[PDB]
């Protein structure tokens, strides 16, 4: 199944934050309407924040997260969860190796903001 | 129901990160085994990270998030989600006022790390 | 926070199914735009299906699950989860007493159908 | 990533229920101890319940859902959600064709019971 693709409400501000847990340097690309809107790159085995940014979902609402390590795409897992019919999380994990911890880059998208 | 209480695997490192979206100054207490382990505070209407830390869940695994603003406990919402039977998110939103956006302090707990 | 309220897409067929795990007889009311659209009643301590139905989310998309035992509202817990940006679950648990198992009536809403 | 595999608490009763939404007849296999513990079969495009059962999660607690249509494995998507730290849902969708609706068989596992 496709993973890391989410339809946000259109024209809505959202936060995106990435954490790293791997010996490999992680590159996280965030696309809005198929166009790169943010890129974070960092390395940590202690869950450091390698980037955080406020974006806007634009006219289409389409948001896609991609993760790669030294140019190789990581395998993604994702889901969206909504609490009290209001608070939204779009969640991504990724695996760059063999251990299937799926935390090598962890990406959290949250909305609404403000 | 009770919200913001999670049973993590015991003796396991986890990340905890808080974001703010409110005119009010948020005070976020993170309790492990019923004792305060971290306190994040700050103010933002733009989803700023007001704290991020690595903690150990200890012998009980019990982690609780509490949020105060204006000297009163915010109303909390929460859930835990597990992806590919490996990657865990414990999610918290909170409401300090009347608009029920539930984003005034947003807390993300993630594990495993490393 | 309000629980058991979900915004579905307008005019969309959805499934609703309820299970019982309590000595109390469970009554599950499903409202679509604030009007009762289905009602299930039954008693089981073994997860029996007390009702399943297909409904239409109608013009508003607003679907509300209420659970009561002989007219007394149970405490509710709920969330929505979306898998691969397409498959939606709206989940409800409920507690009619003191033990906090939250399974006394369990309600699953799923869409799309077909 | 692997989908449809969940760690339940060991030696614990759980409910498993499947719904069908496809022209193809769905075959849902539920494994405990890596061995088939239940199989549900049926055909519906209207979310019919094609099986519901109570099982014990066994020695390991590992429960796996597989779905096939005329013997061909469907692609699976899954996640687990925990509400109020008590009520657990393990959720599966499956895709037998080209439309990416992932509802062709929908499987819900819930625990605890009683
Ligand atoms: C090696 O590069 C694998 C890599 O880094 C490890 C430290 C660990 O985080 C592993 O999960 C990750 O795939
Ligand atoms: C007043 O302090 C209310 C408060 O701040 C607003 C800017 C908005 O974020 C609202 O959701 C929050 O409760
Ligand atoms: C009353 O007996 C309590 C009630 O029924 C029990 C059998 C058990 O399911 C409990 O969770 C429920 O609240
Ligand atoms: C075959 O026709 C495809 C199959 O059945 C359809 C009626 C629809 O449910 C589709 O999602 C499913 O894959
Ligand atoms: Ca890894
Ligand atoms: Ca890792
Ligand atoms: Ca608010
Ligand atoms: Ca706010
Ligand atoms: Ca109960
Ligand atoms: Ca019960
Ligand atoms: Ca399909
Ligand atoms: Ca289908």
Residue numbers in the entry:
A (entry chain C), B (entry chain D), C (entry chain B), D (entry chain A): 1 to 114
Give sentences copied directly from the paper behind this entry.
Here, we investigated 31 diastereomers of the α-helical AMP KKLLKLLKLLL. X-ray crystallography confirmed that high or low α-helicity as measured by circular dichroism indicated α-helical or disordered structures independently of the number of chirality switched residues.
We considered the nine most potent diastereomers detailed above, the Lys → Arg mutants HP32 and HP33, and the inactive, alternating chirality diastereomers HP30 and HP31. A similar situation was observed in the LecB complex with fucosylated HP31 containing four different asymmetric units. In view of the structural studies above showing in several cases that the degree of α-helicity of ln65 diastereomers as measured by CD corresponded to an observable α-helix or structural disorder, we assumed that the CD signal could be used as indication of folding across the entire series.
